[PDB]
Design a protein around this ligand. Structure first.
Ligand code: HPA
Ligand code: HPA
Lengths: 338, 338
DNA sequence: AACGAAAACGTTTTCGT
DNA sequence: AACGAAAACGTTTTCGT
């Protein structure tokens, strides 16, 4: 088809290619004539052919977990903005935490020859770290670890522990001493790490968390629902709760209401993530905000770098969570006494 | 690199290619030897080369509006499941309703030579219908129109009007006669069409909607927020409200609460979409459900068809909305009298 | 029986002059 | 000055025998 264009125009394909890519000077007349043809012939230059030669697809592949979850979804929309602006094409793939599913997309990706790879897998067992490393040659960044699990990749780090700590500290300073917590999955950073950040503040204050007050969640609203319930469904209940993710908080909130308990009036609740629409939770949710957009833009960037400036050394950038006060928390019993 | 494999194995690339694609019989011995090499050499067959020849990329491109919005996001996660299972690669692109942005991704897409194109643009002006048709040769389906706007594409249709109608009819039959409505954008099917489905039921019942009771939204929680407010912020207010989308409902709900009005006790509210987590709205939201997943799987399918069975004739499939009763609606003044 | 040799797919790019 | 001819990128596939 470039051949076809060359001929309607009566110049060499070499010519046509030069004008289409402004890669060498071409007389106006010639240049026009080309476009002329380019047009009527209705030509779409082939990226496949092109990549075949120049050696890069100008496309990036996101090997994610899932994409419906608010959290994830916001991150993804961000990464996409960035590919778009720097000319990349996004290939989105959800592995749902399945090794097989993962071994597959990974390979499909390599085969399609993505210029780099963004990794958001949530949980990383040895088996997965292992496949990951077989692709060390394709440049890549992990957007969701706490520390840097490997040497063959870039890492953007969230400081999830200091998020955890901030959350607890707020409750503490608000008068609270009987706190419960519904962490998310311990096999995830945003799961374990937020918890532990919360747990230090507790020890620090000599607050002890009765095991019957800690109930695992899985980031989904339903998990929050059941965990709330189980908490408030007992003789002795805390006055405040730290919930590992906004969406689950949202479920925690529904149950409180269902049991006719008032928030924050009967139970205070603090979440985490600061999802796009936690302000419209009822009540407006007080939570820890995760820089979602910078987590994304920051990831795209270390990758480009590696890609463009051909970097070989691993790198890591920290990002920082911060408290957003809204209306789901009220002073606790000890406020006045400090 | 296939050449490299051929040689470690001492067979022809032709051979290697036959075993890698099981496209002709190869002796075990030979077959093994190949894999052998395939392995140590650590070979990843090139899809780019391959597509270059066989003529198809085995990849589909989603030219969407945005992907953070619950609604959209759920649809997308669906389409992705389907590509994955039928071997396709997904290229996600958000045009945010911008013509330019649209003219771009469209072209980037063609150039990358996607096997087909899924279209979800929300609004379709002539200018966009126009670009769309310049790509009539790349097979495509529009997942969001009400009727079939063109002849050069497939259409999956939602019956949004009969969704609108169902919603109104519920309110009516619950005792309600003073209803307000916050529709979404009239330039969108899910905007206009839901409204009109609602508006017929009204006329049908001789209920009239005071213009001061209809306030445009844009599907975002904030728009619901402002529109609620404006409704309840006036001398005479309705007792029930029909809100064009769940997320905006969610915002409508927050404001009611903020003005200290009770739902459903003070105002009844019915939404639309049945987003994944409307059940955890507070109160659990009564709404019209949109088959999201079938809207997706149904789209992927007409496309495959066109792609695989090489279809030329346009086609359209209807899908059907349905009421989900939860807890945001209560009987109105006229319940007993019917 | 089981496999090779060689052209082609649609570009980009080196050297020409 | 302004442009062409021809090889190459990494596969698949037709005909061989
Ligand atoms: O794994 C996760 N899933 C969903 N939301 C989240 N927010 C933090 N981590 C997660
Ligand atoms: O355009 C839309 N955006 C978001 N949610 C929606 N639900 C129906 N239509 C829409």
């Amino acid at each position: 088809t470039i051949k076809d264009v060359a001929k309607r125009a009566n110049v060499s394909t070499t010519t046509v290619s030069h004008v289409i890519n402004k890669t060498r000077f071409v007389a106006e007349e010639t240049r026009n004539a080309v476009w002329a043809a380019i047009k009527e012939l209705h030509y779409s230059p082939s990226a496949v052919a092109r990549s075949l030669k120049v050696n890069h697809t100008k496309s990036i592949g996101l090997l994610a977990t899932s994409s419906e979850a608010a959290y994830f979804a916001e991150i993804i929309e961000a990464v996409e903005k960035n590919c778009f602006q720097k000319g990349y094409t996004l290939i989105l793939g959800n592995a749902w935490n399945n090794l097989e599913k993962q071994r597959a997309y990974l390979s499909m990706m390599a085969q399609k020859r993505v210029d780099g790879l963004l990794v958001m897998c949530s949980e990383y067992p040895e088996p997965l770290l292992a496949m990951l490393e077989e692709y060390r040659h394709i440049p890549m960044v992990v957007m969701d670890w706490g520390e840097a699990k490997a040497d063959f990749t870039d890492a953007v780090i969230d400081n999830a522990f200091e998020g955890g700590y901030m959350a607890g500290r707020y409750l503490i300073e608000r008068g609270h001493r009987e706190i419960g917590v519904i962490p998310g999955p311990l096999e995830r950073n945003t799961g374990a790490g937020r918890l532990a950040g919360f747990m230090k503040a507790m020890e620090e204050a000599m607050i002890k968390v009765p095991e019957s007050w800690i109930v695992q969640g899985d980031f989904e609203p339903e998990s929050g629902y059941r965990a709330m319930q189980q908490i408030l469904s007992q003789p002795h209940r805390p006055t405040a709760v730290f919930c590992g993710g906004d969406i689950m908080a949202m479920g925690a909130l529904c149950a409180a209401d269902e049991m006719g308990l008032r928030v924050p009036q009967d139970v205070s609740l603090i979440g985490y993530d600061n999802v796009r629409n936690a302000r419209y939770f009822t009540p407006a949710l007080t939570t820890i905000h995760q820089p979602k957009d910078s987590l994304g833009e920051t990831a795209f960037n270390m990758l480009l770098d590696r890609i463009v400036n051909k970097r070989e050394e691993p790198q890591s950038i920290e990002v920082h969570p911060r408290l957003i006060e809204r209306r789901s928390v009220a002073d606790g019993p000890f406020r006045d006494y400090r």
